[PDB]
């Protein structure tokens, strides 16, 4: 979905694959601005764009260079920005 | 992080584990309101709270009731809401 471009806190996606890291298809979400884009399309700095991060499971060989069964490692990946305020409403 | 409560588009989390589904620790993010909470703490309905969804890998036995190696199935999970507008800024 095109939420990345139409959100108040828009984000850009950055694909990656380290020599041993699997899967290859992982687009890391990075916030466009410090502030948020108000209804008038301007950036307001009394609000902040923050990336929502998810703890999940990714494929990794140990010992390396193996095309079989092994133990999978940890992965910390931001998947989308949101607009926060210092106030708990 | 407490972004879920301090975001303009706040969300509630809903934990689950189906009889065969693994891992047990999966909190599904659900949006609190249709509209977004403006700077003044009010809901504005010319903006919408949308859940950011992530396509990822989850543990599943086939044939069922097996504590060994098998093929893992598909999982569609919303991890956090964001505030959208019909305008592409």
């Amino acid at each position, epitope marked *: 979905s095109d939420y990345y471009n139409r959100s108040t806190s828009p984000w850009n996606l950055h694909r990656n694959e380290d020599p041993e890291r699997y899967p290859s298809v992982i687009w890391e979400a990075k916030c466009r601005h*410090l*502030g948020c884009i108000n209804a008038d399309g301007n950036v*307001d*700095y*009394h*609000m*902040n764009s*923050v990336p929502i991060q998810q703890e999940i499971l990714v494929l990794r060989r140990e010992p390396p260079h193996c095309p079989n069964s092994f133990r999978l490692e940890k992965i910390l990946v931001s998947v989308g920005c949101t607009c*926060v*305020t*210092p*106030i*708990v*409403h | 992080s*407490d972004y879920y*409560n301090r975001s303009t588009s706040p969300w509630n989390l809903h934990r689950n584990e189906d009889p065969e589904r693994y891992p047990s620790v999966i909190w599904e993010a659900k949006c609190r309101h249709l509209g977004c909470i403006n*700077a*003044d*703490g*009010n809901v504005d309905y010319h903006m919408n709270s949308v859940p950011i969804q992530q396509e990822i890998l989850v543990l599943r036995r086939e044939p069922p009731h097996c504590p060994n190696s098998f093929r893992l199935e598909k999982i569609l999970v919303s991890v956090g809401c964001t505030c959208v507008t019909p305008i592409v800024h």
Partner: antibody
Amino acid sequence: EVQLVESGGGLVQPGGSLRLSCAASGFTFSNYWMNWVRQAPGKGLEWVAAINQDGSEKYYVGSVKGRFTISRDNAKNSLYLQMNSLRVEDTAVYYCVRDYYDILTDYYIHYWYFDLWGRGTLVTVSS
Amino acid sequence: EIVLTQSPGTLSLSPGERATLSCRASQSVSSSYLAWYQQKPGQAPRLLIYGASSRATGIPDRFSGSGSGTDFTLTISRLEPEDFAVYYCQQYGSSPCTFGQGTRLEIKR
């Protein structure tokens, strides 16, 4: 004994830079959000910037967009404000302040009010 | 941006009297998130009232808070010499936080 000590004031020319420093003595700094609130000689109180516990979030007043930068150092228990391209309207006494936090269950609740203030330094922007 | 207007600009009263301070908000202040601060010449502000009605740590019983939404009141029931200072209200329900322009309490004689 719980105190806040500002430093870094002084005369600056229009277009200049300054860096205010605030020493947060007598309490665990990492636990609180901090802010810079200014007061023009005689005029009232005005919020300048705010900062998250770890600096993950930096909030600013419209007038200081891309000119001022709040920053902290939980190890050196200090808060700083980087004031660039200073305009005469920036003439004021700047206070560093501590933001009241509460804990209901296992959840930290930040409130944008100031239970502790500093003595403030006077920044003068003139030719 | 919520705009707080305080009345009067300056209040001349004698110790023993009851001071009634007003803070009028341009918009409804969320969950009555309003604070009141005291400020003596040369010194830095001091928190008195939070959540529109709650007295801060150490603040004497004589200080009272009232209000909800747009109209908020600070009351000092039996005035003492150390109560004669400038008074600011501040809201923390709308981002950004804004302050009242102030009301000074002068010792009428």
